[PDB]
Amino acid sequence: GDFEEIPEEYL
Amino acid sequence: ADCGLRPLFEKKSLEDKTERELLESYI
Amino acid sequence: IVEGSDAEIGMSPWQVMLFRKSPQELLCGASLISDRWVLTAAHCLLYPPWDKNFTENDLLVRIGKHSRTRYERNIEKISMLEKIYIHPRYNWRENLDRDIALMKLKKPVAFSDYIHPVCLPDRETAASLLQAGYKGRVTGWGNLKETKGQPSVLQVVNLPIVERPVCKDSTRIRITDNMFCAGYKPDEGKRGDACEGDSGGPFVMKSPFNNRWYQMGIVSWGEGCDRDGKYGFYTHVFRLKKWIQKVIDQF
Numbered sequence: 276g277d278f279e280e281i282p283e284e285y286l
Numbered sequence: 287a288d289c290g291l292r293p294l295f296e297k298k299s300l301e302d303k304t305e306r307e308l309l310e311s312y313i
Numbered sequence: 314i315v316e317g318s319d320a321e322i323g324m325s326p327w328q329v330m331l332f333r334k335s336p337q338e339l340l341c342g343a344s345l346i347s348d349r350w351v352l353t354a355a356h357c358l359l360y361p362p363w364d365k366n367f368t369e370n371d372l373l374v375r376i377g378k379h380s381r382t383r384y385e386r387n388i389e390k391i392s393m394l395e396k397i398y399i400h401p402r403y404n405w406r407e408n409l410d411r412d413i414a415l416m417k418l419k420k421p422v423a424f425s426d427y428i429h430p431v432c433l434p435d436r437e438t439a440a441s442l443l444q445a446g447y448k449g450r451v452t453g454w455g456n457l458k459e460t461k462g463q464p465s466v467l468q469v470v471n472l473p474i475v476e477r478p479v480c481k482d483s484t485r486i487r488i489t490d491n492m493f494c495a496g497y498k499p500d501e502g503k504r505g506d507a508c509e510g511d512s513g514g515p516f517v518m519k520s521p522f523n524n525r526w527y528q529m530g531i532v533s534w535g536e537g538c539d540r541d542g543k544y545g546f547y548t549h550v551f552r553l554k555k556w557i558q559k560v561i562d563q564f
């Protein structure tokens with residue numbers, strides 16, 4: 276919940 | 287090459303708020 | 314970082330964040346030394362006492378960041394790892410001697426106002442700047458203390474290099490020539506130190522001869538954080554430069 280999601284072009 | 291030269295500081299001849307502290311210690 | 318302050322925008326554009334894919338977390342700090350090579354501490358990737366042995370696809374590298382947790386759209390760049398290289402004589406069994414490792418990026422990262430590589434010291438620059446009293450700068454998204462917790466943004470703190478006998482006399486751990494310690498003494502008043510989560514990030518110095526930033530050390534270890542009488546230990550980058558060059562040259 277700490278970190279905001281990385282856009283999925285990578286992750 | 288261009289290494290160690292910050293675009294937002296050295297490249298523009300702007301100093302950050304505490305880099306002087308470093309310089310003052312190099313005696 | 315403990316007793317530091319918020320970093321200015323683009324103040325450390327070689328700052329890199331080692332991020333674990335799942336569970337999604339900050340693993341360590343690192344630094345950008347070229348458009349395809351990242352420097353960090355070996356123990357950030359390999360530490361068998363704690364059952365840590367990350368492979369390439371376990372990690373990601375986030376470059377040009379400021380905020381610790383937010384996805385900095387249009388600013389930060391995310392890179393995958395092609396290969397990890399740990400010093401062959403990295404001593405994880407005893408005292409973290411030669412705590413250094415390189416990570417080759419899958420593709421070159423594009424430099425910007427927030428992304429730019431730091432220089433690595435030659436013998437003279439090292440000889441001239443790595444002296445007791447001379448201050449360096451450490452940056453990271455690590456803990457703010459020993460029990461707030463974690464920063465909202467990249468932290469910075471300037472700390473003086475400490476005399477080798479003082480370093481040695483402050484700990485029971487066997488110190489080597491591949492390390493150097495920094496921080497203020499109890500009688501100096503001023504405080505500051507790296508902390509848990511800052512490992513792998515850079516201890517830099519701005520040369521007064523050519524006004525360029527050089528990475529002299531890598532956050533390695535310390536007994537607690539910002540404890541009176543204790544000092545932060547860093548990997549002596551110049552001392553392991555021949556290995557660094559060999560890896561980059563060969564690979």
Ligand SMILES: *[B]([O])([O])[C]([C][C][C]SC([N])=[N])[N]C(=O)[C]1[C][C][C]N1C(=O)[C]([C]C1=[C][C]=[C][C]=[C]1)[N]C(=O)[C][C]
Nearest residue numbers: 407408409507508509510511512533534535537538545
């Ligand atoms: B890092 O991974 O984020 C962390 C930084 C620690 C504080 S640095 C400071 N105050 N300047 N690095 C460590 O935890 C390393 C990795 C393995 C253990 N280690 C330590 O700092 C140890 C001391 C030590 C143990 C074994 C070999 C060398 C040194 N510190 C403690 O034991 C845990 C707090």
